[PDB]
Amino acid sequence: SDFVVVANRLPIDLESWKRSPGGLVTALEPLLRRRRGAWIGWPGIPDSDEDPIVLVLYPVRLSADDVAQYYEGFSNATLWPLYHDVIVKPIYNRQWWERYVEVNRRFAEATSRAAARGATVWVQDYQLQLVPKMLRELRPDLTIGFFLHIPFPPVELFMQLPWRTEITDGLLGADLVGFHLPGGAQNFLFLARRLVGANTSRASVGVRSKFGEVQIGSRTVKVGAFPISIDSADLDRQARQRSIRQRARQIRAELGNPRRILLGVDRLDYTKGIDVRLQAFAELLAEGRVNREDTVFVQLATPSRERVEAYRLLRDDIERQVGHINGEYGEVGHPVVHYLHRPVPREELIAFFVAADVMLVTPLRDGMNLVAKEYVACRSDLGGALVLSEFTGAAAELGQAYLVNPHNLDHVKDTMVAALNQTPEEGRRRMRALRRQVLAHDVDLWARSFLDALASTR
Amino acid sequence: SDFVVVANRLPIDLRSPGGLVTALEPLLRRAWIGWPGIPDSDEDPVLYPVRLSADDVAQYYEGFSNATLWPLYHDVIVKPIYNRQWWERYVEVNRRFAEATSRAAARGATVWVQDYQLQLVPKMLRELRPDLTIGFFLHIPFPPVELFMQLPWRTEITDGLLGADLVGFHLPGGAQNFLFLARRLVGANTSRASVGVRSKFGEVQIGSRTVKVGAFPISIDSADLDRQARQRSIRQRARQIRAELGNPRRILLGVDRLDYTKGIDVRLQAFAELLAEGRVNREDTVFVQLATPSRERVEAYRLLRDDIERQVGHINGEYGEVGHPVVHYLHRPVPREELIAFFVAADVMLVTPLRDGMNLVAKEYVACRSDLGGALVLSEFTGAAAELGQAYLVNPHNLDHVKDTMVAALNQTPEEGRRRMRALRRQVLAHDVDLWARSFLDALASTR
Amino acid sequence: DSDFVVVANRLPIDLESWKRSPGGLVTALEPLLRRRRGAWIGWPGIPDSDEDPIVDGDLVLYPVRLSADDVAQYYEGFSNATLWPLYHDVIVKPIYNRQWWERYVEVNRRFAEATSRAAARGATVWVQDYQLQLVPKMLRELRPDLTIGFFLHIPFPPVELFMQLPWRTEITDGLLGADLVGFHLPGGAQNFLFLARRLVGANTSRASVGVRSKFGEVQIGSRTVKVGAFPISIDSADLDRQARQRSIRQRARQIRAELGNPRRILLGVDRLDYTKGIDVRLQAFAELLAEGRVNREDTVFVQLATPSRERVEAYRLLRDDIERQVGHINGEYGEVGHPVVHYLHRPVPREELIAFFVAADVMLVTPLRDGMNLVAKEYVACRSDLGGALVLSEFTGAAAELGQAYLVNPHNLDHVKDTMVAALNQTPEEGRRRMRALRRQVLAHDVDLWARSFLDALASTR
Amino acid sequence: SDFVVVANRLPIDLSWKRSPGGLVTALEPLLRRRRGAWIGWPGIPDSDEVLYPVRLSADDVAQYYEGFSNATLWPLYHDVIVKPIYNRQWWERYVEVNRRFAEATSRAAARGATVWVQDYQLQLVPKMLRELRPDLTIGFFLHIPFPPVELFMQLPWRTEITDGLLGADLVGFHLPGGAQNFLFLARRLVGANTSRASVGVRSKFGEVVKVGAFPISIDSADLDRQARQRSIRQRARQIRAELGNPRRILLGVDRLDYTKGIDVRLQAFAELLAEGRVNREDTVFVQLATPSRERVEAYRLLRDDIERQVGHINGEYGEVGHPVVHYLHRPVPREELIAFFVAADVMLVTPLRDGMNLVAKEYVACRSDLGGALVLSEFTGAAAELGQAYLVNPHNLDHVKDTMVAALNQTPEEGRRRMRALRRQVLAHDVDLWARSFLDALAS
Ligand SMILES: Nc1ncnc2c1ncn2[C@@H]1O[C@H](COP(=O)(O)OP(=O)(O)O)[C@@H](O)[C@H]1O
Ligand SMILES: Nc1ncnc2c1ncn2[C@@H]1O[C@H](COP(=O)(O)OP(=O)(O)O)[C@@H](O)[C@H]1O
Ligand SMILES: Nc1ncnc2c1ncn2[C@@H]1O[C@H](COP(=O)(O)OP(=O)(O)O)[C@@H](O)[C@H]1O
Ligand SMILES: Nc1ncnc2c1ncn2[C@@H]1O[C@H](COP(=O)(O)OP(=O)(O)O)[C@@H](O)[C@H]1O
Ligand SMILES: O=P(O)(O)OC[C@H]1O[C@](O)(CO)[C@@H](O)[C@@H]1O
Ligand SMILES: O=P(O)(O)OC[C@H]1O[C@](O)(CO)[C@@H](O)[C@@H]1O
Ligand SMILES: O=P(O)(O)OC[C@H]1O[C@](O)(CO)[C@@H](O)[C@@H]1O
């Protein structure tokens, strides 16, 4: 293989198979499926095999302890809570870190058994931050690039991590290190100067331009900001099949023809602000500011990481909110909140985007968020309204949505009422400006921006 | 007035909640000393008002009555709180009830005291006015004596009740509990035989007076509930209710106050497990729970409400579709005709309390099904199970058996359902609230 | 083939190297089976042990192997998270679990199979306590030639709560395979005869049952099951003499010196168990200090708590609330170098425990419920000087023999605090009167008297 | 008066008693020198009013003080250790109470006077007092950390707090980090022209109004002479004998606050004892903790957790008559505290986040003998001046433990060496050096 991708997930998921969750699959699978090459990742279950399925995929077998301590543990109960501004208190555990080190080392060695000479390797995300340095040690001929799909925290918080130095050096084994936002890339150059003691650049980093540099002995490390997106054009087009439109109409009938339909779509994850949108909706019903008989909210929540107790805690609290709200304001035969805890099939989800008057995307912190960009591409009729949290990476590109600080609950409620009350002229004006950005900045633009930057490092 | 009823509150709120109100109201219609249901009330009256300060409500009503005695008499489902400041308020407020009873009573009058919040009234009243004839009926269970002895004030609770001429319970086993405490804790000479149902009553010597003790199981005004359930408006609304749920094959009903004695959590776990096991189709079966809010300034009541709402949102998320939940859950009282329409539409009635002195909801259902369909699933730990043996009786802690019993009731032959319904309604119609009042009062009058 | 075999879940030793096993079941029965020959079946305290027998000096033991899943679902599960909480008036909510019921069934069978191997033709078997209540019916089915006794060391709950158990019938059936069923008290005996007429439809004697006399009866076809009340005790005279040793009496003087010679010492000694009232006695102590009614400079409370069943979640929650109380009181009322509460979370050696009984001015025994409770009797036997004061919860079985203690309802905290103040301030004249009356009972009603009339009642069924 | 100080706190707390916290420990004697004026709150509801006290209702205490100040601002400014609460009623209170502080400042102020308002409870008063009295000079110093921008932007009232601060002529922080976090904000949030370069300590300021970094210290020489008293040295010995003459003493001293890391040192100590690496017979830990904000739920929950650790370690490794941890939940008198500083072989200073921490500086100034050792958390402002302490990251429990073993068994020579350099710093950079710096900038 002249070209290898390394990520924890594969594009499939074993139960028989299934699509893997998350936006890294949403974006990489359409891109790489078009590109013959190799992919290394975990089959989503413990103690599988290492036999490939044919592009070419290589499964990494993880033991029961690898999953609990590197995946559920160091990755999702240390790195994840902390990188999103310690929403949940992180846990610092030495056995999780020791297992983190060892799994990353097995990934670096699976890449080597795949990476031909001089090949181009591309490593993905927070679970695999030591692989750049490990892989260079084994394999100094490779061109290595790394993209983090989650935010990179402020310096004062990253320094909590007992292994702050080994994570930084792990990332600097690559030739190019990328982030969604210039904010993440500037956090990084700071931490390189003020922890590993390297010479870094001092200007600010640009979007797909004005890249920074770190000087590591006899090597030079490039740093950049590359905001990911979706395969905008296929989705825009898939949303125009007569079947989807006719299905959107049937959805609103199955609900008893409300005047306004509000929607949320997310993995069930404490970053996502699902609890914020429910509380704001409940206080709006309480205040008589929405009509409880012709207005309804649907929440499509995908189960995620449910053996982590911070997720089961969140699940318990969100379920309580749904029975509470319906208990007070619904009628028999007529909830005001419809709550579903499973992954919807792609075509059924597109109908929901089309049926929805108001999209609710309220994360407390999010590296990017592709649900926001998917809704915008699905509305070639220019109806709808996107209520967008400013703590997402998308608010930097989607300025024409209605933008909220999710911690100001009055601002959330105010902005929900305005989106419900927008004029046709105002809603179409915004949906046009938002659609023009998303169609121009798709996943193609993002992938060619990163790998042309990586190619220059040679 | 020559006939005086004494109860915690009055028959309208500011209709009233509980099984005490949906019983004594139709009777009475054919003085009343009670609390408005509000703080610092006025004082004008025939009704007599008892004003409670903000602190009487918290320490006498919400504290002692509903966070000490209520959980204790119900087999300590929730840990009871023994608070001597609550006891002192309880005593005080009991005294205003006795005083205003005296201001309303005539020389030689009969008085009738109701339920667990006024247990000291009889003895206080008997001292103020030994010319009165006094009755007392407890509408909640009487706990076993190894648990009643926890009370720091167990001797004083028992002394108050003995200021009466007739002490009454729903059940014999409660009447006999009370005679044990009369013999051992107050040392009085008591009867030793078992007590019958409205017969074979017992007695306790207290000076030159004999206290009658007995068992009188409360009921509903059966025949009236039957005729109102036969009307076209009700039957048309029951057809329509089922259409608004998308025409289910099978409907199950829970109806109760949101209280930790009622087993709303049990019927939800059993129903979620059945859905998980494929033993009930999530497409044509549906459950409606109608929960009246209750005592939510008490924190054990909020803790219960949070986890039932958690249950509702969890079961719908796993088995429901958008536009079709499998559990509809309402947290408000329902107008009386609307409720009767749900008794008629309901194929299976789930009454699964962990402990209940007497459940009237299960007899209301019985009385509403003159078409002889439907099915009653009934906790043995209600006083009602002693009269309604032809229901589907369960121990609500035997969860496998609870789940088994709901399937059998959902899947009965109609001939079997009609046989059981025929037997239940013979009992309920022959033993209404009118049987129960004349029975108690023919015994209270017997002590002159 | 032994002509006399005792079977209990515990053995008198526990493998961690051997230590003495916990509980008052072991304190009463051990010194008795060194005297008499016989066999003892029990579980060695860990899983996946072997079956080879053990040399306890003269005593000889049969270990019962349990797998890890036997420990979790039978021991930790059904016994101690279903039976223990429910028999103690649902102080904690029992968990009703059919798989725990299934493995409680399987293990009772394992214990009955191991006794049958050991019992000779015609032997006497004495089965102990709540872990093993299906064993008698199982053993009578294997071995109709056997004389079966069963004793329940914990209380037997009122009928209204025992009915909550989905296996109420099968537990009552399993006790009725015995030739004699014994309890501490007549209350427990009278509940059982009520459940037998009510549940299994048997014909039952309906009169009161007396103390080691006035036995009840249960008709099982052609077999008749005797029922009685037998209040366990300790080795009263041997403890009294152990306490008279110089070495024990100077350790007592030295204990008080390392506490800075307080004027008053208060002591509690129990397994860390939520039936024990340790939270109660710490709450009362703290409020007496707050109110100024006990002197913080010359009074100190010592609590000796042995870890118990620490893998059951209710027991870890209890542990953490109590440890919270300890730090809270010492930080409010203690000085640096001088706490007002001393707490140790480990078993104490027996000669060290005796010296604490001797040094202690007030013994605090405040369970919310206890089938009997032997610490109250152990303290009394030690105070041959006639000093000391016993504060005893009336919900302990021992309160029916120890009426001259300072008796409290633990739920009446105001009264508990007043009774603690009066015990600390009693005249010498008044404490000797009570201590002298308490010791007259304990020395006359010892463990020999208890086992003698239980077993002679058993041998009266042949 | 021509110098008016405004803080939530007075120097006495109500019978008048010493006020808690390090803001007063430094500036109580520092300003007992030059006379002036001071606007504060007596620590008690409804007070009737040199010192000028502000009165608060029972609603203003709950919502402005227990609520917005210590349940919104304090958790957020300390790296969201606790989840902050964002309640608009608290915020409307906080506005109205700041208004009253500013108005008492206004009667107390004459024309041209100097004002110096103190701490996070009063960030709106610089703008309020300039609109009211444009003649005054106004300075402000923040005594807690100033949070990273990604966190501060959570605040629904982010723009108002930045504008209440920009009402002053000089804004001061302990560290250049807070000084530079605050310059970015003024650019980004309010849209002002700000300087770009690193701010240095007491120099190389920024501009929008002057922005500077001013590390607060203590009154270093007065504590040192107070620590050498024969009376203090005899009590230190009396204290060691009262514990059974241990071979080593460890000492923690702080308010009972979740920022202080008291739980971290209890856990490290419990594990060293389980591992056999500390001797349960000759080594003992003393923790002196002052109650703080105990009507606020997150503090009562901390309190419960820490008491449980104390009960758990003693029942595990203590013997009857001899705990391993003595824990005291009351403020100690000054003379007896200093005696504890002199007795202790190791000082445990493990905040998860602290704006400065003067307890470390206090211990350093007491040990004129050069004995002792100071284990200090790197997330204190002090760690920037006390680099020869034994520095730890308190989230690395394994390193905290290793460092407690090395400080407990240091050579006398190693110990004296670190302590001579520590005293060199603290003796030369004291409370008065700090004050002359800010006010020169302010007077500029
Ligand atoms: N309940 C759901 N059902 C079906 N698809 C979902 C559901 N929730 C999320 N998705 C899809 O998963 C992907 C999540 O992408 P993204 O919004 O960037 O967040 P993340 O990667 O953190 O999960 C999207 O493509 C989204 O459409
Ligand atoms: N959600 C509800 N809506 C309308 N009526 C209710 C509701 N819940 C209970 N009731 C009525 O309140 C009365 C209470 O009946 P009962 O079984 O004796 O229990 P309790 O006295 O403990 O409330 C019944 O008549 C019932 O019909
Ligand atoms: N901390 C302890 N150290 C040593 N022995 C103890 C300790 N706690 C209890 N014991 C002993 O264990 C036995 C407890 O018996 P008992 O009071 O009947 O209650 P239980 O069997 O429930 O534990 C007594 O013999 C007592 O002396
Ligand atoms: N238990 C205590 N007894 C006496 N003084 C204390 C106690 N705890 C803290 N102090 C003093 O309070 C002051 C506060 O110290 P500091 O480190 O500045 O933190 P903060 O200002 O947040 O309270 C110090 O001078 C310290 O000596
Ligand atoms: O944790 P999961 O199940 O892999 O899914 C969530 C996905 O979202 C991401 O966290 C986005 O960073 C992916 O790394 C991850 O694969
Ligand atoms: O053996 P355990 O479970 O550790 O507890 C101690 C003892 O207390 C008892 O429950 C007393 O009945 C014994 O059966 C038991 O052996
Ligand atoms: O005044 P309190 O509520 O006791 O707080 C302690 C002190 O901590 C400080 O932040 C010191 O940094 C002061 O602002 C405050 O007075």
Numbering used by the authors:
A (entry chain B): 10 to 24, 32 to 70, 74 to 477
B (entry chain A): 10 to 23, 35 to 50, 54 to 68, 75 to 477
C (entry chain D): 9 to 24, 32 to 477
D (entry chain C): 10 to 23, 32 to 66, 75 to 233, 240 to 475
Provide excerpts from the study.
Although we did not observe any effect of F6P on enzyme activity for MtrOtsAs, we nevertheless attempted to soak this compound in both apo form and OtsA:ADP:G6P ternary complex crystals and also cocrystallize it in the presence and absence of ADP and G6P, all under CHES-free conditions. The structure obtained with F6P shows this compound occupying the donor site, in the presence of ADP, with the enzyme adopting a closed conformation. Nevertheless, OtsA could use only G6P as an acceptor, and F6P showed no effect on the enzyme activity, indicating that the presence of F6P in the acceptor site was forced by the high concentration used for cocrystallization (5 mM).
OtsA is a glycosyltransferase that uses the α anomer of G6P as acceptor and NDP-glucose as the donor to synthesize T6P. In this pathway, which is conserved and essential in mycobacteria, trehalose is synthesized in a two-step process involving OtsA and OtsB2 enzymes. MtrOtsA is composed of two Rossmann-fold domains with a deep catalytic site at their interface, in an arrangement typical of GT-B glycosyltransferases for other organisms. MtrOtsA forms a tetramer in solution, as previously observed for M. tuberculosis OtsA.
